[PDB]
Design a protein around this ligand. Sequence first.
Ligand SMILES: CCCCCCCC/C=C/CCCCCCCC(=O)O[C@@H](COC(=O)CCCCCCCCCCCCCCC)COP(=O)([O-])OCC[N+](C)(C)C
Ligand SMILES: Nc1ncnc2c1ncn2[C@@H]1O[C@H](COP(=O)(O)OP(=O)(O)O)[C@@H](O)[C@H]1O
Ligand SMILES: Nc1ncnc2c1ncn2[C@@H]1O[C@H](COP(=O)(O)OP(=O)(O)O)[C@@H](O)[C@H]1O
Ligand SMILES: [Mg+2]
Ligand SMILES: [Mg+2]
Lengths: 714, 714
Amino acid sequence: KYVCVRQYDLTDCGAACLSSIAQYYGLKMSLAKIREMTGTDTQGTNAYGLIHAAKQLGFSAKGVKASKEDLLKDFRLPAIANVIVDNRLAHFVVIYSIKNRIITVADPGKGIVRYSMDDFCSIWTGGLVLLEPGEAFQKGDYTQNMMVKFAGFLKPLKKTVLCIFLASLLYTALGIAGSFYIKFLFDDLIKFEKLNDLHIISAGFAVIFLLQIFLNYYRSILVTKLGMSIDKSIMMEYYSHVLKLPMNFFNSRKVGEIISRFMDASKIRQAISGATLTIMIDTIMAVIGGILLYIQNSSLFFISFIIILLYGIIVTVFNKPIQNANRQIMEDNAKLTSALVESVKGIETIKSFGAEEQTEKSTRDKIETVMKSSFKEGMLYINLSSLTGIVAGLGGIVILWAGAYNVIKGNMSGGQLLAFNALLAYFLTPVKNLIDLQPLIQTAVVASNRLGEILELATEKELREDSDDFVISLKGDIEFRNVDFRYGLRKPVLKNINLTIPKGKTVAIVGESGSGKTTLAKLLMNFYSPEKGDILINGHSIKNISLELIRKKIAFVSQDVFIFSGTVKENLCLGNENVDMDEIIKAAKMANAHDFIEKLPLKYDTFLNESGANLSEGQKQRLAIARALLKKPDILILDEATSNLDSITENHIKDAIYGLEDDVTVIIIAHRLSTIVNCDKIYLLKDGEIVESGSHTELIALKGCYFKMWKQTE
Amino acid sequence: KYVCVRQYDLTDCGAACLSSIAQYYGLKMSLAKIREMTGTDTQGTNAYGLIHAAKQLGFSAKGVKASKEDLLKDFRLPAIANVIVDNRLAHFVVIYSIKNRIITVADPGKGIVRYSMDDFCSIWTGGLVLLEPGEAFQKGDYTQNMMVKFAGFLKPLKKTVLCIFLASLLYTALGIAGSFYIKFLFDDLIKFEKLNDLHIISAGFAVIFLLQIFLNYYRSILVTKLGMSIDKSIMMEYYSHVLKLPMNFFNSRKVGEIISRFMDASKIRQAISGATLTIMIDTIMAVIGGILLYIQNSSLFFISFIIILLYGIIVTVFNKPIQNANRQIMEDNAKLTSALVESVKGIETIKSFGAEEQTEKSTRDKIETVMKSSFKEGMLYINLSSLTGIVAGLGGIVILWAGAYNVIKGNMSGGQLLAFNALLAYFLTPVKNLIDLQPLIQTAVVASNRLGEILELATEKELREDSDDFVISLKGDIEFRNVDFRYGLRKPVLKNINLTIPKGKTVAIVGESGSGKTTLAKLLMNFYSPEKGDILINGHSIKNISLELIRKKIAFVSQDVFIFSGTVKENLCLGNENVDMDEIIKAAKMANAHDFIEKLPLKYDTFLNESGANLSEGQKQRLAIARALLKKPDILILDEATSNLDSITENHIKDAIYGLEDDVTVIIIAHRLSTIVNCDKIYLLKDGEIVESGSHTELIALKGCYFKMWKQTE
Ligand SMILES: CCCCCCCC/C=C/CCCCCCCC(=O)O[C@@H](COC(=O)CCCCCCCCCCCCCCC)COP(=O)([O-])OCC[N+](C)(C)C
Ligand SMILES: Nc1ncnc2c1ncn2[C@@H]1O[C@H](COP(=O)(O)OP(=O)(O)O)[C@@H](O)[C@H]1O
Ligand SMILES: Nc1ncnc2c1ncn2[C@@H]1O[C@H](COP(=O)(O)OP(=O)(O)O)[C@@H](O)[C@H]1O
Ligand SMILES: [Mg+2]
Ligand SMILES: [Mg+2]
């Protein structure tokens, strides 16, 4: 069988292909784990990541660039081929069989498809990855059934589910009892002209219906409460786990990918609470209805069974094409909305270049594509509805025909036929719902896998080693031994930095843009870990210091500061909750912010709308600096904290942090060389290694890269 | 009556309040016209904007701060009051009546509400705007009916609407004829034991049903085609008008506000093609069904009429609360999504400050609020469904009861009762749909107004003056006369900006961040117009040159560069539709971009994913510079176009610009002073003024702000 693992996101096509190959060869594991192994980033994965993950997964993989002629030759069928769609997006596919000019490929985006050779090589890039099990490829099933894990949420709520079951049973029994009103009307009351009996029986059936309505009300309230509880539990569990995952999880994913998993909570709930309750109620409901129908007449029961069989066959046949059309519509709508967002976000360039006519044409073409996909799905739905209506109406007419024939033959009465028509609802609707549960359960299973593969990921605290409790301070020499680092599986950023930062000293790191300075700042702060080597504080390894203390004694002022929607009192007290106002005022004094914030409306409680969109960039930078010095750190890192600020405020903060109390280490990452000349030591980093060090005068005396940069920049 | 104009967006509370006041006083205008009159930006309007718009509208408006005791006294009741909603939003409300300690206020976000004086004063800021009509307040109704305007898309589609109407009439007639099968069964066939007649009549009714199904198929296909056509037409008209609007429309609105009308298009279409057709079909079909039911039996028809009256009353009663609950749910979901996006985007700061615990608490609280709103709406729906089910089921039971009574009394037969039960569908479903049209029509009207206020806005071309056809190029001295400017209604950016760029000589403009240099760059390109004075080229006013020529002969490289999703060639040729590859290569060389593009996969057709997300900042900026020089301009503006470049590329672009042929004017807006020294003339901008002009030699010698900044920044 050709395994085709669906891709959950837009950037895990290669991971999906590798998972498909592994499952075909007998190894099934989490797709999130493989996506971590392949070094998948926000820009998808590449061939090298696939080969590396296959090699370290047990396979014996290799890469090869081949033309169309090489495909005619013989080799291992299950290979991964890099393809390009629409002179556009680059995907990966799994070739499963090279037949006569026709190639079967599993594409994670679409499914199992057949491409003729010519168009395949038109879209297939020359790259190719060959896989084959090696010496150590122990087969396994390292994954867990995730519907059971989420269904375990029903254990605390067994009292609510039990009441729903009883209410549903009583509702069904009352409805079945009340469906015989039409039988009692024609066979007994109308025929014999009984009036008092008519009134009494009608009043009794009205009371029965009112009881049925009350039971439905109670059951609906209970079901709504159960669904809300399950939704809240699932969303809160997912969010609580996500907030603890390491930093390499957030930089390998987009905001949309993380946020969209919340809808998966409702998708799972719709089958955890809905599908199970529907099954339990409708199985007994349909069994009772079928027994009663067979009691009424066997032939009519068989006719109704044939009707429901035809309905189920039609629905099962139409299942997959409808979901394919829905996926295509979703893709087209995403493309159209992305184009609209891009064209309205860069409207200034379009206006300047006079491209308002071609943008309109492109948008119209995308709208046409969306309409074509919508028409395809609508035609599918119309065909399905027409077939279902034919089946239902012709079955009803045939049931009436056969019932009239049976009444004529004397096998049954007219009231019995009308009672059969009434019980047809209580027999067919449960089975109809049971059949219709199939599309919901598949979507719920997909969402359960998508949301629960993340829950298996180890958090940041679980990956840490054993910590030594005798360390209570981070004051001391900061030693960078031979440190390697690379963001995932890209080219290395840091190669052989080996430096020492003395305690209580103002140290500066300068270099070209995109050279590995912010990377060093994040490495010191324990975001990510060095691939090779160690980082030491006061002679102690960075891995042996508790994560809570390491994040509480190191303050960061990033290049792209972030301010959350809230009061200034809350934006300046993100971590701690018990802090005096005097400390906040003192912290804002050194950042040249208190005078600015005082001019704002009210006091240190003004709400910052839209992540501080009313704020300006320099003001937010001052706020971030104030927060950093408010944290009272042992090490303070300023990653270009004065890039936007004017000369006066920059000088003010420079003299403020220059004369700080206590032996608090200060590191300043600078792009403009003239900004800092008074730093105790200056480190020159060019392409991932330090080349020069010392005081500013010392590097000037020693002719080298620093002097050339100073001369060409000043 | 108390007028309460609801707000269409999140930033038009003050505009909605002013519109409500005007409508209360007899003047009705478009909300978009008022919104642009108030100077509403993306952060909303304030008291000054409302006062200015009211004075422009003929009112005699004033602004004053009021205390709690001030409300005790008497003043003009219809006044706008600034309030603070949930310590987050600076909203505006319209006070209408001051009753005994209870204040009636129209809030555009909620409706007409009543606040206790204590609670209001707790949520009411001291500010107050008093409005009163002046000498010139000629009333009117300066707006059009958007529903009638959007109903004009049915004119070319009058043939399709006619086919649908005829098919629906035939379908309804066939169904009404086929509903008598059960009447023929019991009164004629079963009673008299007719078998061959039974088979013949059953076959005939089956054929009738098949014809009905075919008619439904054809009508559904036509309806789908009609809906798709109308939706596409509305969407394309809206986008075509939006692309032609001035820039003050695009920077006063968010991206979401502009994009959200593409769903309003579908909302309008749902009533353009749904409401009219439903009315036309259902009125006639309900009339026929009611006449037939009255023919069958008068008392049962009256019972069914009472049933449908009760259903309509219940639906009308439950209309408003359901939509209020839905709006509340939408607001809460939007808040939760915004919080989730904020938390995910700023995960680095949360981790660095160890604030995962409190972010989880805030998200849980927002989830709880969402669940509360969801439960309120669910309970409203449960109550509505229970009442409707009671009415329907008890009506059916009562109809069966009264029909049996009439059959016993001899006023009708059993088959007549069964036929009445059958025709109950064709009588009750039409009126049910007509009653259910109310939520669709109101939402469609709101969406139509929202989408059509924009279409009344004047485009960029319509606001221009007469164009001089004798102007063919913009090569000449560029004179800024006494020029004032201010974005929207904020603090003015330029005061007396007066300067002269010589023809063909490279000139630089320097200053602080947020000083008003990019504003000058936009002003020279007809984005926005100066409040006072004129801008001239070669003695010709900027307002007398065709907008097509101005945008064609001026090239702009903004501080932020936008790259559109597409091949490099398409981006480099955004405006012109015809150009040879040699010029593209030549332009790329002088911007130091050709070498980078060569190393990319493919040569120049490399599609740039996600608006060029693959490229770096320097690569994007070099590509934009290449595009601008490819434009072949007469004036080239570089608004900080060398910031992200390294020194080598900076020098290459610098001496490429200095090596430009022809007398092409070059303007360079520079932040770093050292970046430009060789410019022919330098203008210094500090506060909306040029205080010092000249080359580097004289400006350094002359003591002033430029000398101080050069000394303190180098
Ligand atoms: C909650 C949602 C409910 C929605 C339904 C809304 C309606 C609800 C209420 C409906 C009741 C009122 C509607 C009319 C009912 C009688 C009509 C009829 O048969 O015609 C006859 C009624 O004249 C009579 O003789 C009266 C005797 C009543 C017969 C039994 C009716 C059973 C309905 C159960 C009662 C309702 C229980 C209420 C429970 C809901 C007239 O023709 P006749 O045969 O010649 O009459 C002989 C005497 N005569 C010559 C003097 C006239
Ligand atoms: N989040 C990320 N994911 C993948 N690669 C990154 C990320 N951030 C930076 N890089 C890469 O690492 C290199 C180092 O950049 P960085 O150290 O951030 O520059 P700077 O030191 O100027 O802040 C860059 O060339 C960039 O391509
Ligand atoms: N899109 C806008 N809407 C409203 N006000 C703006 C907008 N852009 C700029 N401003 C205001 O006008 C001034 C113009 O500054 P600007 O020329 O952008 O500075 P710079 O030359 O450093 O880019 C700014 O101080 C800002 O407050
Ligand atoms: Mg950086
Ligand atoms: Mg600028």
